């Protein structure tokens, strides 16, 4: 039937976070704290699109910027948080009670040399707005016209001509 | 459809043709038709799990769980024949014929 | 996520991209033909992603997570 | 099932005999096993052997009792040269009667089966020619 | 005598279970979310027959959605064609598919 | 068949339309000959107990045409409705559809052909 | 052959099916659903689904322990046949094996058998989702809606289970 | 009724301390004071994403950011 | 048995007859016949005897394998369509296994080898709350998909029906397979109209319970289970012989009778299709069924056989048994004609 | 798949035992090591004779009470739920519905003994 549109190996070719998961829970907090924007964006973006084909400047933005954060995360305080993340990773569940001492020191730097407010207990969880400028897609499922429903029942109700009219009986 | 699909409903019609098919013992065919619903609880859990319909999770187990509350009947249906013949036979179980 | 999108994006295209060398000499064939009436987007099943691959990946991938202890 | 009375039906009737004599043929073998296999279903053969000789008996007679049939209505129609005359079918139930009254050595069942398929078969012929229907789809 | 007492008394017993596409917890979408939503709306209120004989399309493509065998039948056919074509001995697999790829993360 | 006009609203008994149609009158011959048969079940009663059977009970033959007029009564309001929506389904679609179904021109019986078979 | 592991199970699956579906006795049939049963439910767990895996083996460990019980209480002959003491228990046997053979060669084959529908040659997990349902499972989430969501179904449950053994009560009393 | 109390403690302590739990925890969580708190902490735990919503301009209770204090915020369980 | 246990059984059993009635889920549907299943069951071992053990267990084998076919169907509707919703199936063979299921649920021919033994293993009261209340689950469901019906398996299944309950109570002494086989019948006759006019189902149904709860409250009055106790009821009462002949002559099929009432009106829904030849068989198997009834009516009301001297005795009580509705049940069944179009209130 | 491997392993282990208990020793058998033990006399009868066993009802039941469990099982993840008031209401009526079962078992005599 229809045909499928998938875009080219060149616009997907971006350079990528080549991290571990230890490395991304460590700065977890202060990623979505500083990098809420972009991030809201793509989320926003696909969620409301519903086509990855259709959604790929917004990754590229969210990967730029994440990028971009654990640039500044390498400049300024790169010893304190191998420290956190390696004490991180050393536990199998990836637990964030173990590992006190190392996030206070780490939250500690970060504010002292860098400034940035480590959110508290559900404040990522809040639902956020978003200023964007995309318009909004009438028809995001490609469907098609309805069908016309039937007609409704208009009118009094009259009653039976010459009774039930079902053989000889007249009523 | 697929392959293992096949598989569990030739299983419940082998199971079908079991019990349909008797061999002078109830409590056989009981074993039988408990193995048909056997690949009916198989098929319907495999059904959901790959169409990934999580809120119809319950109806398998709970069509397991009706499944034993009519066996036991069954089995409280064999005893009552101990009861009153010495064996289940079911060559034995013509009375109701006049 | 972005992660995953670019990921499934990038496997479709290698699939789609390697569907062409392989099937010319056949009559009657559209290469990368969709089986939906409409051009919306699906999620596409594990066959379309590594139905080309080695058979190492498809137990270290469908099966482990299950068969990971 | 659905092939085997749409291919008697698909041959003009009174032309070639062979093959309808062999469609009818199959069609009563068809029948026999049905009735062969419920009468063994429902009533215990003593043994294998009885079994499968009760199986062949109601074979062999459905089967000549379709043969029969199709064979006279054959030369019936070929002989008055009429298609579309009932006349024939009539002629192959009394056939088919005489047949079933020869199998079970009976001669009232003879006559009887001859007034009863006889009958039977004309209407299946006006049934045929006037286009009644056994299964009438809901129309209304 | 199909006495909906569901909707006399106003009471949901078994409405919220008997659709794919209904309410789930911790809002889970199934396999085909999205064509059981296209093929209720298109058929919904202007009757059985109706809907079968003009929501066809719809419900077409939900059936390929949740059986998936057009699919099995095109990845059946390359399949058969690369183990032919491996079988003569004109086809190479490329590195990429062989395994040493190094994907994308 | 009517399902479908019981399809929005169900176990209704007697609709809000159903109250703009002309009740039946207490006079109505269906109304007596229900009446009847409950006069006849309190006969019954009145025999296969071994009583007298048009002197004992006079209260339980007055409750069996009391209740027996009663349901009645409903069932034929309910039977008239049924009717009345029907002819108007009826008329409704027939308003609706002219192209399905069209006008019929009737001639005069000077130029229709019609074969005469003597009787002889 | 390797990723047939839901295919080979299968395979095993019928295998008892038609080894228990002879009717021996009881106890030997009860032995051949249970190994059935056992490589089922390894099919539900090769499917991502411990829980109902395990509750169907809890389910038949428990009521075909009854059966055992049961047919070592009243349904009991002189002399039990295995497989192989009458002929049409290991006659049906080698039949229904040999039938399950033979649409196991016909399914890898041609890949495309057709017994009512039609059906594939390639497994089941080419069917399997390519996404992650974050820190759950969603089939506990069921099981744990069953509470909340399933009203009316719980309580036709409940009050069945109630009736059943206010039944079973009731039957065998005598008089 | 406190004579037939002490036979059946009496007869069979079990019973009577089956019946005892039974009937506080039937009318204990009734008369709770924490039931409402284990609601909110139930609906407090952030399970999927919380994906925002397209703007028309006029919402005064939605953030822009999560360190905003327009918002729900989760003090009285970091209390309690 | 405890009356307040034998109160919760009933209650179980309208309750499983109500879900299958109420649920708009194949589940909850299937539940409910479990329901229904599992409290029938010691409503027939009520009297703790052999022959209630092999019909309960005849009973149970049959309604296991029906349950199991319709869960099969359901699955394989699931499979094909995605829902539950109760309406259209959406393959053959499922509408295949749920037809076989109905079938072999009803007692439909075939699968008609067990309806007569079960019905005379078991009492009156049980074998009315038989073939009356197992008859309304089933025909609610088959109501519920028409659409998915094949045509060519119904009819043969209901011409299969009427034919074999014909030459069934044709050969019967016993009073229980009679009404059996002419169950049958009627079933037959009801489920031949189901594609066409399921309003004519529903009167037909409704009309066969009246009647068939009308004689089995007669025959729970009388307390004869035979045919020679039947005719012996004469000399104890001969209003009970009135009322019997009446009865028996309605369910034949006589006008001004109210078993005229549904028959002729299934013909006047089956020749609007174009449908003729069928309703003439029906009619004539319907013929054969008015025989067997003639030949009981002979038994019992039109000729008055010999008695025994002990009945003297019997005229010196009356009748102290309850009989639940017993003339209004049988005005019913004997005129309801000139209040012919009350079927409308059935739409 | 490392389950597969224990499972395995299990049993290869298990059954190299009984092999190395069987054929590794030296065998002489007779017709009376083979013969049944009675306590040193010849068996009445043979053991397939039907026991007249007590208890059919109480593993019924047991069978019963294992699907109340298997209702009750899957409770703990319903702790997470958020209608509260349901789930504990309804988790109540199921333990209760157990209890009156049992009640009735208790009152009736079904958890004593036959004969
Ligand atoms: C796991 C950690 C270690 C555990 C301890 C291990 C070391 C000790 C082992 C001791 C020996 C055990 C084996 C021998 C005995 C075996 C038989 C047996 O156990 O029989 C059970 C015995 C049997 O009783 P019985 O044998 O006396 O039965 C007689 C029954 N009547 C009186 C009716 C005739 O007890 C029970 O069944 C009771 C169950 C345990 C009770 C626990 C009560 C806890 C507190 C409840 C609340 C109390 C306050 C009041 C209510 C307040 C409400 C708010
Ligand atoms: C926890 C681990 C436990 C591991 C297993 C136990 C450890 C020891 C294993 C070896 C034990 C000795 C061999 C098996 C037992 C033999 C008993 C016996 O008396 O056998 C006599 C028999 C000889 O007696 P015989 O053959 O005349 O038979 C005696 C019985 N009559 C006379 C009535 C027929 O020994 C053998 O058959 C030899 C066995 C092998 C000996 C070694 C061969 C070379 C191996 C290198």
Redesign the pocket.
């Known amino acids: 039937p229809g045909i499928v549109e998938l875009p080219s190996l060149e616009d997907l070719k971006v350079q990528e976070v080549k991290v571990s998961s230890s490395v991304l829970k460590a700065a977890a907090h202060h990623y979505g704290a500083q990098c809420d924007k972009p991030n809201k964006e793509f989320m926003l973006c696909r969620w409301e699109e519903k086509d990855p084909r259709r959604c790929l400047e917004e990754g590229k933005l969210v990967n730029q910027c994440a990028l971009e954060f654990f640039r500044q995360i390498k400049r300024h305080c790169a010893e304190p948080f191998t420290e956190y993340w390696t004490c991180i990773d050393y536990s199998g569940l990836q637990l964030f009670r173990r590992c006190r001492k190392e996030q206070a020191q780490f939250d500690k730097c970060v504010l002292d040399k860098l400034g940035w407010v480590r959110p508290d207990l559900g404040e990522l969880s809040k639902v956020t707005k978003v200023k964007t400028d995309r318009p909004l897609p009438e028809n995001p499922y490609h469907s098609r016209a309805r069908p016309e429903p039937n007609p409704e029942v208009e009118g009094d109700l009259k009653p039976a001509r010459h009774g039930s009219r079902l053989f000889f009986w007249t009523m | 459809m697929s392959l293992v699909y096949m598989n569990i409903m030739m299983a419940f019609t082998v199971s079908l043709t079991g019990l349909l098919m008797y061999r002078s013992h109830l409590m056989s065919s009981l074993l039988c038709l408990e193995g048909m619903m056997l690949s009916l609880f198989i098929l319907a859990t495999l059904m959901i799990l790959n169409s990934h319909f999580t809120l119809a999770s319950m109806m398998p187990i709970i069509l397991l769980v009706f499944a034993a509350c009519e066996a036991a009947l069954g089995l409280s249906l064999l005893v009552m024949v101990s009861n009153t013949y010495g064996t289940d036979y079911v060559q034995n179980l013509n009375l109701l014929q006049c | 996520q972005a992660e995953k999108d670019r990921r499934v994006l990038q496997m479709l295209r290698e699939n789609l991209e390697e569907e062409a060398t392989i099937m010319k000499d056949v009559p009657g064939w559209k290469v990368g033909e969709s089986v939906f009436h409409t051009t919306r987007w699906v999620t596409p099943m594990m066959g379309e992603l590594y139905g080309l691959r080695t058979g190492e990946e498809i137990l270290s991938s469908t099966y482990g997570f299950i068969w990971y202890t | 099932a659905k092939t085997l009375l749409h291919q008697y039906w698909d041959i003009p009737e009174g032309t070639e005999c062979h093959r309808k004599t062999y469609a009818a043929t199959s069609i009563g073998g068809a029948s026999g096993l049905v009735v062969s296999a419920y009468s063994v279903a429902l009533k215990t053969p003593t043994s294998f052997l009885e079994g499968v000789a009760r199986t062949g008996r109601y074979t062999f007679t459905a089967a000549a009792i379709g043969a029969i049939f199709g064979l006279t209505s054959c030369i019936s129609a070929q002989v008055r040269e009429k298609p579309d005359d009932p006349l024939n079918y009539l002629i192959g139930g009394c056939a088919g009667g005489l047949t079933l009254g020869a199998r079970t050595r009976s001669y009232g069942i003879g006559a009887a089966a001859c007034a009863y398929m006889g009958l039977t078969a004309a209407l299946v012929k006006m049934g045929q020619l006037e286009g009644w229907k056994v299964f009438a789809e809901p129309k209304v | 005598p199909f006495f909906d007492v569901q909707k006399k008394l106003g009471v949901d017993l078994d409405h919220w279970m008997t659709i794919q596409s209904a309410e789930q917890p911790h809002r889970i979408p199934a396999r085909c979310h999205a064509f059981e939503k296209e093929w209720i709306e298109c058929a919904h209120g202007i009757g059985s027959i109706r809907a079968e004989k003009e929501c066809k399309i719809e419900f077409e493509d939900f059936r390929e959605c949740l059986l998936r065998q057009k699919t099995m039948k095109r990845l059946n056919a390359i399949k058969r064609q690369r183990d032919k074509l491996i079988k003569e001995g004109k086809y190479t697999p490329p590195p990429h598919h062989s395994g040493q790829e190094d994907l994308r993360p | 068949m009517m399902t479908g006009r019981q399809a929005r609203a169900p176990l209704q008994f007697l609709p809000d339309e159903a109250r703009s149609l002309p009740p039946p009158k207490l006079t109505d011959p269906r109304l007596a000959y229900i009446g009847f048969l409950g006069y006849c079940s309190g006969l019954i009663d009145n025999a296969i107990r071994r009583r007298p059977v048009l002197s004992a009970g006079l209260h339980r033959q007055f409750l069996y045409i009391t209740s027996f007029v009663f349901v009645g009564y409903y069932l034929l309001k309910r039977q008239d409705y049924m009717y009345a929506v029907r002819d108007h389904d009826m008329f409704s679609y027939i308003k609706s559809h002219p192209e399905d179904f069209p006008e019929k021109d009737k001639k005069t019986y000077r130029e229709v052909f019609e074969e005469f078979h003597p009787v002889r | 052959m390797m990723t047939y592991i839901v295919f080979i199970l299968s395979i095993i699956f019928v295998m008892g099916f038609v080894g228990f579906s002879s009717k021996p006795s009881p106890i030997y049939g009860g032995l051949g659903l249970i190994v059935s049963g056992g490589v089922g439910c390894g099919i539900v767990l090769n499917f991502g689904g411990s829980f109902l895996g395990l509750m169907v083996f809890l389910i038949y460990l428990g009521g075909m322990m009854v059966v055992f019980g049961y047919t070592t209480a009243m349904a009991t002959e002189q002399y039990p046949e295995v497989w192989v003491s009458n002929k049409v228990v290991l006659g049906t046997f080698i039949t229904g094996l040999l039938m399950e053979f033979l649409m196991v060669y016909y399914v890898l084959k041609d890949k495309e058998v057709e017994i009512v529908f039609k059906f594939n040659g390639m497994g089941d997990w080419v069917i399997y989702d390519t996404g992650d349902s974050g820190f759950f499972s969603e089939e506990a989430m069921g099981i744990a809606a069953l509470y909340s969501y399933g009203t009316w179904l719980v309580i036709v449950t409940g009050w069945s289970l109630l009736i059943g053994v206010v039944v079973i009560m009731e039957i065998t009393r005598g008089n | 009724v406190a004579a037939f109390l002490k036979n059946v403690w009496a ?4 019973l009577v ?1 089956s019946f ?2 039974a009937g ?1 925890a039937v009318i204990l969580p009734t008369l709770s004071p924490y039931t409402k708190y284990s609601l909110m902490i139930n609906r407090a735990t952030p399970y999927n994403y919380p994906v925002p919503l397209r703007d028309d301009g006029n919402m005064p209770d939605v953030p822009s950011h999560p360190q905003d204090p327009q918002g729900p915020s989760l003090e009285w369980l970091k209390r309690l | 048995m405890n009356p307040i246990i034998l109160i919760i059984i009933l209650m179980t059993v309208m309750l499983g007859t109500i879900i299958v009635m109420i649920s708009t889920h194949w589940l909850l549907i299937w539940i409910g016949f479990e329901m229904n299943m599992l409290a029938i069951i010691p409503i027939m071992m009520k009297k703790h005897n052999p022959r209630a053990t092999e019909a309960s267990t005849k009973y149970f084998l049959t309604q296991s394998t029906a349950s199991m076919l319709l869960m099969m169907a359901i699955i394989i509707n699931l499979m094909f369509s995605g829902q539950w919703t109760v309406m259209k199936l959406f393959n053959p063979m499922a509408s295949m296994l749920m037809t076989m299921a109905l079938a072999m649920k009803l007692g439909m021919a075939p699968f008609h080898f067990w309806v007569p033994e079960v019905t005379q293993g078991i009492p009156l009261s049980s074998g009315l709350i038989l073939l009356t209340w197992q008859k309304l689950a089933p025909m609610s469901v088959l109501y519920q998909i028409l659409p998915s019906i094949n045509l060519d398996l119904i009819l043969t299944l209901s011409i299969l029906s009427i034919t074999i309950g014909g030459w069934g109570g044709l050969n019967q002494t016993q009073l229980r397979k009679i009404m059996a086989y002419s169950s049958i019948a009627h079933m037959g006759w009801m489920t031949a109209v189901l594609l066409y006019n399921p309003t004519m189902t529903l009167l037909n149904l409704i009309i066969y319970i009246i009647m068939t709860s009308t004689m089995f409250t007669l025959f729970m009055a009388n307390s004869t289970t035979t045919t020679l106790s039947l005719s012996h009821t004469w000399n104890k009462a001969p209003i009970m012989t009135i009322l019997v002949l009446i009865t028996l002559l309605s369910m034949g099929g006589l006008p001004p009778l109210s078993g005229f009432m549904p028959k002729w009106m299934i013909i006047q829904e089956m020749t609007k299709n174009d449908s003729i030849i069928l309703p003439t068989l029906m009619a004539i198997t319907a013929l054969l069924n008015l025989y067997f009834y003639m030949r009981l009516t002979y038994s019992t009301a039109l000729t008055m056989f010999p008695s025994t001297n002990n009945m003297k005795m019997k005229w010196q009580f009356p009748t102290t048994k309850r009989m639940t509705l017993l003339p209004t049940m049988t005005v019913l069944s004997t005129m309801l004609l000139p209040l012919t179009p009350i079927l409308s209130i059935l739409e | 798949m490392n389950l597969m491997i224990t499972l395995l392993t299990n049993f290869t282990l298990a059954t190299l035992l009984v092999t190395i208990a069987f054929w590794l020793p030296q065998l002489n058998v007779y017709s009376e090591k083979t013969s049944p033990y009675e306590c040193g006399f010849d068996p009445m009868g043979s053991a397939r004779l039907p026991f007249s066993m007590k208890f059919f009802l109480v593993a019924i039941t047991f069978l019963l009470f294992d699907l109340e469990i298997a209702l009750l099982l899957p409770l703990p993840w319903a702790s997470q739920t958020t209608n509260l008031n349901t789930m504990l209401t309804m988790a109540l009526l199921l333990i209760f519905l157990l209890a009156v079962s049992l009640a009735y078992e208790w009152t009736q005599k079904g958890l004593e003994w036959t004969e």
């Open positions: 007869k069979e302590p079990v301390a005892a739990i506080l």
